[PDB]
Amino acid sequence: EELKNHVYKKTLQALIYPISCTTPHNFEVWTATTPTYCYECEGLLWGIARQGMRCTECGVKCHEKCQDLLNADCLQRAAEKSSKHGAEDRTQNIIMVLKDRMKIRERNKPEIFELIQEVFAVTKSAHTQQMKAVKQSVLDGTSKWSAKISITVVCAQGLQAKDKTGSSDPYVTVQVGKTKKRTKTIYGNLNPVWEENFHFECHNSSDRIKVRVWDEDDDIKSRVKQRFKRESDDFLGQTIIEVRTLSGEMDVWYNLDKRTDKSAVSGAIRLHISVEIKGEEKVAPYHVQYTCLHENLFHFVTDVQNNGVVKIPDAKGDDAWKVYYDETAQEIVDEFAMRYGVESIYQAMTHFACLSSKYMCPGVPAVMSTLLANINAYYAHTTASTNVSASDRFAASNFGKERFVKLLDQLHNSLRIDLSMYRNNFPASSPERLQDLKSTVDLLTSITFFRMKVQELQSPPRASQVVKDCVKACLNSTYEYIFNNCHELYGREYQTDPAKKGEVPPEEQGPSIKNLDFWSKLITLIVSIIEEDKNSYTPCLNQFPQELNVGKISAEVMWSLFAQDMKYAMEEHDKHRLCKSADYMNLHFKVKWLYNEYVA
Amino acid sequence: RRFAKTISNVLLQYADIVSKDFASYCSKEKEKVPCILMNNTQQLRVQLEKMFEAMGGKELDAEASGTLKELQVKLNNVLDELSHVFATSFQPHIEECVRQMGDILSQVKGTGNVPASACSSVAQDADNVLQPIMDLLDSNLTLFAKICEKTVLKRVLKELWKLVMNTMERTIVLPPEFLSKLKDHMVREEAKSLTPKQCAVVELALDTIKQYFHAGGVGLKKTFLEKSPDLQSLRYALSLYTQATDLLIKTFVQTQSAQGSGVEDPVGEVSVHVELFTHPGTGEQKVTVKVVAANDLKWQTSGIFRPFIEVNIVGPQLSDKKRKFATKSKNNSWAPKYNESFQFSLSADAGPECYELQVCVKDYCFAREDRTVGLAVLQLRELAQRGSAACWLPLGRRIHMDDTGLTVLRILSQRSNDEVAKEFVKLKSDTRSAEEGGAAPAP
């Protein structure tokens, strides 16, 4: 529960002042009125030769090339700048525009804060008071926000090569406002491990931790480049972590971004960041909070609003897998995620984990299959300029590789089980359950394909085969079922006198030595099943047409089981000879026909 | 363990001493004594549960517990037996009653055209019909409801309810003499069916008996009584007596499933090739029947044998359709080839499983009469899978039937003006005119 309550306070704080209605920076060209360091890259803005851009509203100053790296909110930046320059009236005016933005937000979208309240089961009163408290927490700006930050630079994976050697000597500079520190250099390695900890004091949650990875050029060419450009140590990539996206003890793979157009950048940097925020001590990471939010919101939408039914959202295009809910619930997770730096793939792998519990529910296997094809396409294909396997790029998942691998394995097993009773679990009398069956297999394929493509597994249990086994298992159980219920089934489905439709003995809904009629009836039921498999299940299960034909497998298994049984039975009849010659001849004609129709 | 044996021995020896004398007390002057003995027995079960619990119940030793659970089930069964033995001493009276109920109901017929003592209301006729048994029931069930413990009463009542339902079914709804008076040959009477008015009256007498046995919740639950197979069977037999000719005929084809699994004592055989066409031109069903030949015709006759094969279709909705074909005749030929192809229409509605071919060989006899040599049934349910079948149908002397075929037939024979029923009854009632090779078959 302790995470649930904190996530609620953070989600209200996020959504009371959402990022989607942050003010844009109004950048004038600016000549630095004092010797100034760019708020994003820390290069000297001075004179005409090193003009920057100054946002009128926020008085953030940056290079032109840096103005777009400033995801820092203009109004919070303005409140901070105004504070750091002693402009208190401007600070308060910005606090008033921030208030009006929060009043607008509550007035325009009260149903958000109501849905948060219901998702987190909070009372309307404790909600209104916590709402007043989070309004104040946003109007603390960052003048009443401070933190200690403990940045362990763990490793990078997949860095670019910039040396004459075709490798690099990567090191990291970590900058947090006023203070710049650097890791030791790792030489000749595109996957460097530093495991180096820096301490920083942050007085501003709209500061950004600029983690820049650099190739340590100590050579003459670097000493030359230093005169013209401020980043001599040939830039390998960065991550610019907004301090509002820090919470507690984080352990995060950040993909590296391009600073400049001449930057070639690849790979990721694993950063372990402990953050001790004033008034938010020992809080969970925003990934874990987002998971908790998404799980509670999912369980609320599915179980509480929809009585268990997974309401599939109306969503289309290559971003459909990023839509999990109706608009209000969607805006909750998206503003939480966007405010707190939770990458879209994490959100997806999380929602896939939610859906994996409800995978039996209608349409879900299609959504899950699609979602997993996207999660697959993300890790598999994204950027060939990387020198890292899909499995290693997936080991850089902040969801956890292991966790997703296990999740997929459990799901794959649950799918195997349900497919092992596919007839019962997906009755032909429901086309929609046949479509769920189809999408259950399409999900199993997507899992096997994910194992093959993302995990780069050399021998995943081939989906067609897995399904074929399931079908065999179901067919065995079907065979048993019909072989135990023969007379009931036959009576009902074919018998032209209603008085014969009923419960003839189990030993005649099963084999008799006195009469062949069980076998005749069993044959017609076997036919009915083979036809149902041929007609319903084979079209349904056309994913592997060259490897899986349900009607063939049905005929083969059903004939096999029947044939073993029939062979023992005929051996037994051959001993007793209680039925007449003619009856065995008629049975022979039927078996001949059955064989020749479906088996031959 | 030692003591549980003591208990078991003593209480079974009680139950036995009682059970042995029980029947001697089931005579009409001492009705209370059986009830009391049943109550003793039941009081043993009750006091035994107390004693089982006093012996620690669930905390008792496993073999002692097993012994006493055994004992309780045995005693339960003793009580069931005693309840049955008790209910059985009423059986002759219930039979006499139900025969009297039958003597009264014979005076009610289809009374919309009969005097006001029998076009007496459906209620008043039900009450008159019931009077013999309600003298029995009211008195006895009210006495038992007092003097029997509620477990004893319920068991007695189930055994009595069954006994009444079965007695009414046997004695009133399916009286064995209605074999004689229009299933069988004995009397050219219309038998008189259970008429709509006597179907009513009975259905109301039964609801009253059910209410009596329910006794406003003091007796058997309405749910037991409604689910009673005894009642459901009685209702079924009753439902037949009003059912439409086609529905009776469909019922016959669906029920007489065994008229398609080997004639016993055959009189020859017929080669047919049959093609069901779910008619590719219409989605009706048409039945092509190629009569190829007959063989082994047991008919070495006192004259010129001139066999031909009648083929008949049987099933519902055939009034508007050609029910009969025949081959040409063949002179002096116990193995006559024909190669003649006929084409019945079935209905569009009723599936092939509602139908059967009946194939009859006859000796052609001008001046005389065309003697039935033999008859075979083919169930078109088989052909519903097979599509087309070559088969050698063994020929019988008569078609073999169950109680429901024979019940439907005796019902249809009372519809002695319905032309479809007449031809159906006539067609099923066709048997081999015995001679030249023998009279009665096997089933």
Tab-separated table of C-alpha atoms in Angstrom, chain A residues 89-354:
chain	number	residue	atom	x	y	z
A	89	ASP	CA	7.399	39.975	-8.509
A	90	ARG	CA	8.150	38.063	-11.758
A	91	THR	CA	8.526	34.863	-9.680
A	92	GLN	CA	5.107	35.427	-8.052
A	93	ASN	CA	3.504	36.380	-11.418
A	94	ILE	CA	4.797	33.048	-12.737
A	95	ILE	CA	3.442	31.308	-9.609
A	96	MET	CA	0.075	32.975	-10.543
A	97	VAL	CA	0.245	31.735	-14.177
A	98	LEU	CA	1.110	28.291	-12.663
A	99	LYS	CA	-1.986	28.575	-10.332
A	100	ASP	CA	-4.257	29.637	-13.238
A	101	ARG	CA	-2.902	26.665	-15.286
A	102	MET	CA	-3.771	24.299	-12.364
A	103	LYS	CA	-7.290	25.897	-11.940
A	104	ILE	CA	-7.839	25.657	-15.732
A	105	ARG	CA	-6.716	22.007	-15.509
A	106	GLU	CA	-9.053	21.077	-12.647
A	107	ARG	CA	-11.966	23.003	-14.199
A	108	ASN	CA	-11.383	21.616	-17.708
A	109	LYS	CA	-10.631	17.973	-16.658
A	110	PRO	CA	-11.998	17.246	-13.129
A	111	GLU	CA	-12.712	13.636	-14.250
A	112	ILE	CA	-8.924	13.026	-14.292
A	113	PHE	CA	-8.569	13.865	-10.626
A	114	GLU	CA	-11.805	11.976	-9.858
A	115	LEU	CA	-10.487	8.901	-11.765
A	116	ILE	CA	-7.144	9.127	-9.905
A	117	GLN	CA	-9.151	9.352	-6.709
A	118	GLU	CA	-11.238	6.275	-7.624
A	119	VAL	CA	-8.222	4.269	-9.030
A	120	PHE	CA	-6.450	4.903	-5.714
A	121	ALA	CA	-9.727	4.538	-3.678
A	122	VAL	CA	-9.091	7.888	-1.889
A	123	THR	CA	-12.048	9.832	-0.347
A	124	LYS	CA	-13.273	13.022	-2.100
A	125	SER	CA	-12.180	15.006	0.981
A	126	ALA	CA	-8.649	13.511	1.361
A	127	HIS	CA	-8.421	13.970	-2.410
A	128	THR	CA	-9.345	17.707	-2.235
A	129	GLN	CA	-6.823	18.256	0.597
A	130	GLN	CA	-4.038	16.284	-1.075
A	131	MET	CA	-4.985	18.271	-4.225
A	132	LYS	CA	-4.466	21.553	-2.333
A	133	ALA	CA	-1.139	20.078	-1.060
A	134	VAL	CA	0.122	19.078	-4.576
A	135	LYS	CA	-0.923	22.523	-5.897
A	136	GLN	CA	1.375	23.982	-3.241
A	137	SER	CA	4.154	21.442	-4.086
A	138	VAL	CA	4.059	22.712	-7.740
A	139	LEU	CA	4.108	26.369	-6.457
A	140	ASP	CA	7.166	25.612	-4.311
A	141	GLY	CA	8.503	25.936	-7.901
A	142	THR	CA	11.949	24.745	-7.168
A	143	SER	CA	12.805	27.436	-4.580
A	144	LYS	CA	11.378	24.925	-2.047
A	145	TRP	CA	12.692	21.853	-3.778
A	146	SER	CA	16.215	20.561	-3.009
A	147	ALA	CA	17.980	17.216	-3.288
A	148	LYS	CA	21.164	15.273	-2.783
A	149	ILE	CA	21.934	13.144	-5.863
A	150	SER	CA	24.291	10.100	-5.874
A	151	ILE	CA	25.060	9.275	-9.515
A	152	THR	CA	26.770	5.961	-10.014
A	153	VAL	CA	27.792	5.840	-13.670
A	154	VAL	CA	27.571	2.017	-14.048
A	155	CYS	CA	28.387	1.207	-17.705
A	156	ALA	CA	27.698	1.969	-21.320
A	157	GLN	CA	26.852	-0.575	-24.002
A	158	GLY	CA	27.157	-0.194	-27.788
A	159	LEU	CA	29.057	3.111	-27.989
A	160	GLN	CA	30.202	4.484	-31.323
A	161	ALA	CA	33.840	4.155	-32.569
A	162	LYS	CA	35.774	7.492	-33.144
A	163	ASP	CA	39.528	6.478	-32.957
A	164	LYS	CA	42.023	5.584	-35.780
A	165	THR	CA	41.794	2.123	-34.126
A	166	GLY	CA	38.030	1.804	-34.989
A	167	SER	CA	37.105	1.872	-31.251
A	168	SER	CA	36.978	4.663	-28.576
A	169	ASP	CA	38.347	5.633	-25.158
A	170	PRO	CA	35.015	6.537	-23.491
A	171	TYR	CA	34.667	8.588	-20.326
A	172	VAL	CA	31.609	10.301	-18.871
A	173	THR	CA	31.230	13.900	-17.689
A	174	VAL	CA	28.352	14.271	-15.250
A	175	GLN	CA	27.180	17.858	-14.842
A	176	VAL	CA	24.520	19.041	-12.448
A	177	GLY	CA	24.158	22.818	-12.700
A	178	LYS	CA	27.238	24.580	-11.219
A	179	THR	CA	29.296	21.353	-10.771
A	180	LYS	CA	30.980	19.214	-13.474
A	181	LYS	CA	32.661	15.864	-12.562
A	182	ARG	CA	34.129	13.134	-14.798
A	183	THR	CA	34.599	9.382	-14.719
A	184	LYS	CA	37.927	7.832	-15.378
A	185	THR	CA	38.403	6.819	-19.010
A	186	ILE	CA	37.900	3.279	-20.240
A	187	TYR	CA	40.222	2.681	-23.187
A	188	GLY	CA	39.438	0.826	-26.459
A	189	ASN	CA	36.005	-0.420	-25.250
A	190	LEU	CA	32.550	0.273	-26.812
A	191	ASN	CA	30.851	-1.364	-23.745
A	192	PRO	CA	32.756	0.392	-20.916
A	193	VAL	CA	32.078	-0.334	-17.215
A	194	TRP	CA	32.912	2.626	-14.902
A	195	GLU	CA	30.927	1.859	-11.721
A	196	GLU	CA	31.866	5.434	-10.581
A	197	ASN	CA	29.830	7.481	-8.063
A	198	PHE	CA	29.497	11.257	-7.950
A	199	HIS	CA	27.652	13.313	-5.379
A	200	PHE	CA	25.725	16.468	-6.409
A	201	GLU	CA	23.526	19.019	-4.668
A	202	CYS	CA	20.545	20.123	-6.721
A	203	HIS	CA	18.512	23.190	-5.739
A	204	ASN	CA	16.248	23.005	-8.823
A	205	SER	CA	14.175	20.059	-10.222
A	206	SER	CA	14.345	21.870	-13.648
A	207	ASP	CA	18.063	21.327	-13.566
A	208	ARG	CA	19.154	18.486	-15.790
A	209	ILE	CA	21.834	15.883	-15.189
A	210	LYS	CA	23.906	16.103	-18.342
A	211	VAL	CA	25.592	12.750	-18.625
A	212	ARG	CA	27.902	13.156	-21.655
A	213	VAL	CA	30.003	10.289	-22.969
A	214	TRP	CA	33.220	11.384	-24.659
A	215	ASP	CA	36.152	9.807	-26.423
A	216	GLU	CA	39.314	10.973	-24.566
A	217	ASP	CA	41.404	12.492	-27.356
A	218	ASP	CA	44.666	13.720	-25.665
A	219	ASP	CA	46.260	13.988	-29.183
A	220	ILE	CA	47.351	17.003	-31.303
A	221	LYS	CA	44.023	16.928	-33.296
A	222	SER	CA	42.115	17.431	-30.029
A	223	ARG	CA	44.360	20.288	-28.898
A	224	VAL	CA	43.539	21.850	-32.348
A	225	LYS	CA	39.736	21.184	-32.194
A	226	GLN	CA	39.617	22.724	-28.638
A	227	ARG	CA	40.122	26.241	-30.141
A	228	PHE	CA	36.996	26.028	-32.373
A	229	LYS	CA	34.594	23.719	-30.429
A	230	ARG	CA	33.991	23.156	-26.681
A	231	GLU	CA	33.641	19.333	-26.911
A	232	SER	CA	37.069	18.148	-27.973
A	233	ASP	CA	36.726	14.697	-26.476
A	234	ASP	CA	34.990	13.271	-29.504
A	235	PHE	CA	31.378	13.061	-28.449
A	236	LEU	CA	30.015	9.517	-28.123
A	237	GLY	CA	26.504	10.421	-26.914
A	238	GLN	CA	24.604	11.914	-23.973
A	239	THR	CA	21.640	11.494	-21.694
A	240	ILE	CA	19.960	14.620	-20.238
A	241	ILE	CA	18.027	13.408	-17.248
A	242	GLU	CA	15.479	15.992	-16.061
A	243	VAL	CA	15.735	16.134	-12.242
A	244	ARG	CA	11.878	15.860	-11.944
A	245	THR	CA	12.305	12.326	-13.523
A	246	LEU	CA	14.434	11.274	-10.533
A	247	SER	CA	12.913	9.483	-7.557
A	248	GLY	CA	14.618	7.378	-4.915
A	249	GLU	CA	17.142	4.708	-5.884
A	250	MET	CA	16.919	4.460	-9.721
A	251	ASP	CA	18.862	1.913	-11.894
A	252	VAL	CA	18.286	2.970	-15.539
A	253	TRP	CA	19.601	2.307	-19.058
A	254	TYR	CA	19.442	5.577	-20.976
A	255	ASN	CA	19.798	5.350	-24.755
A	256	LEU	CA	22.412	7.881	-25.873
A	257	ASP	CA	21.258	10.948	-27.855
A	258	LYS	CA	22.949	13.162	-30.514
A	259	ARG	CA	24.103	16.574	-29.250
A	260	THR	CA	25.029	17.950	-32.744
A	261	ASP	CA	24.450	16.968	-36.384
A	262	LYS	CA	28.150	15.943	-36.714
A	263	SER	CA	27.609	13.562	-33.785
A	264	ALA	CA	27.411	9.918	-34.701
A	265	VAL	CA	25.827	8.300	-31.552
A	266	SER	CA	24.888	4.768	-30.566
A	267	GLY	CA	24.409	2.674	-27.448
A	268	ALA	CA	23.099	3.280	-23.959
A	269	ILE	CA	24.431	4.235	-20.526
A	270	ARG	CA	23.326	2.435	-17.321
A	271	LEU	CA	23.081	4.934	-14.491
A	272	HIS	CA	22.305	4.108	-10.900
A	273	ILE	CA	20.970	7.336	-9.391
A	274	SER	CA	19.953	7.703	-5.739
A	275	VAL	CA	17.996	10.924	-5.159
A	276	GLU	CA	17.189	12.317	-1.682
A	277	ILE	CA	14.494	14.962	-2.470
A	278	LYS	CA	13.384	17.249	0.410
A	279	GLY	CA	9.834	16.226	1.454
A	280	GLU	CA	10.042	13.029	-0.699
A	281	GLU	CA	12.545	10.772	1.148
A	282	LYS	CA	12.866	7.009	0.380
A	283	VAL	CA	10.395	7.195	-2.553
A	284	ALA	CA	10.258	4.482	-5.276
A	285	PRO	CA	11.636	4.967	-8.856
A	286	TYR	CA	9.186	6.366	-11.369
A	287	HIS	CA	9.298	3.125	-13.372
A	288	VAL	CA	8.019	1.245	-10.267
A	289	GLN	CA	5.559	4.049	-9.569
A	290	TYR	CA	4.367	3.947	-13.176
A	291	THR	CA	4.000	0.169	-12.937
A	292	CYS	CA	1.981	0.624	-9.755
A	293	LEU	CA	-0.121	3.388	-11.418
A	294	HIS	CA	-0.689	1.298	-14.560
A	295	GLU	CA	-1.498	-1.843	-12.546
A	296	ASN	CA	-3.940	-0.003	-10.271
A	297	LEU	CA	-5.456	1.861	-13.182
A	298	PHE	CA	-5.716	-1.414	-15.147
A	299	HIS	CA	-7.242	-3.326	-12.203
A	300	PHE	CA	-9.569	-0.356	-11.652
A	301	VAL	CA	-10.632	-0.138	-15.308
A	302	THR	CA	-10.840	-3.883	-15.880
A	303	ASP	CA	-12.031	-5.240	-12.524
A	304	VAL	CA	-13.685	-2.208	-10.879
A	305	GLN	CA	-15.234	-0.240	-13.807
A	306	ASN	CA	-15.716	-3.256	-16.170
A	307	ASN	CA	-16.412	-6.127	-13.648
A	308	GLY	CA	-13.336	-8.002	-15.028
A	309	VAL	CA	-13.859	-7.271	-18.766
A	310	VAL	CA	-10.754	-5.849	-20.447
A	311	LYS	CA	-12.089	-2.853	-22.391
A	312	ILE	CA	-9.833	-2.844	-25.445
A	313	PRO	CA	-9.260	0.842	-26.413
A	314	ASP	CA	-10.195	2.115	-29.878
A	315	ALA	CA	-6.640	2.786	-31.188
A	316	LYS	CA	-5.066	2.618	-34.694
A	317	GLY	CA	-1.697	3.150	-36.439
A	318	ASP	CA	1.893	2.405	-35.330
A	319	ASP	CA	1.149	4.197	-31.986
A	320	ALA	CA	-2.005	2.050	-31.166
A	321	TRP	CA	0.095	-0.214	-28.867
A	322	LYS	CA	0.748	3.014	-26.841
A	323	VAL	CA	-2.984	3.407	-26.143
A	324	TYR	CA	-4.116	1.239	-23.230
A	325	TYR	CA	-7.358	2.976	-22.062
A	326	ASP	CA	-10.027	5.606	-22.735
A	327	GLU	CA	-8.757	9.222	-23.019
A	328	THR	CA	-8.854	10.108	-19.304
A	329	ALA	CA	-7.050	6.969	-18.130
A	330	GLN	CA	-4.676	7.293	-21.078
A	331	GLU	CA	-3.845	10.909	-20.150
A	332	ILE	CA	-3.111	9.763	-16.570
A	333	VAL	CA	-0.480	7.237	-17.577
A	334	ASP	CA	0.923	9.397	-20.403
A	335	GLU	CA	1.304	12.529	-18.226
A	336	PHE	CA	2.744	10.442	-15.424
A	337	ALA	CA	5.124	8.777	-17.909
A	338	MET	CA	6.073	11.988	-19.809
A	339	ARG	CA	6.547	13.992	-16.562
A	340	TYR	CA	8.567	11.206	-14.941
A	341	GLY	CA	10.704	10.035	-17.951
A	342	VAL	CA	9.140	6.550	-18.289
A	343	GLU	CA	9.878	5.408	-21.825
A	344	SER	CA	7.023	4.175	-24.057
A	345	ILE	CA	8.521	0.649	-24.359
A	346	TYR	CA	8.463	0.303	-20.539
A	347	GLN	CA	4.808	1.375	-20.513
A	348	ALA	CA	4.068	-1.236	-23.203
A	349	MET	CA	5.946	-4.104	-21.541
A	350	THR	CA	4.083	-3.170	-18.336
A	351	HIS	CA	0.676	-3.127	-20.059
A	352	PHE	CA	1.554	-6.407	-21.801
A	353	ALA	CA	2.272	-7.789	-18.305
A	354	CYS	CA	-1.190	-6.564	-17.193
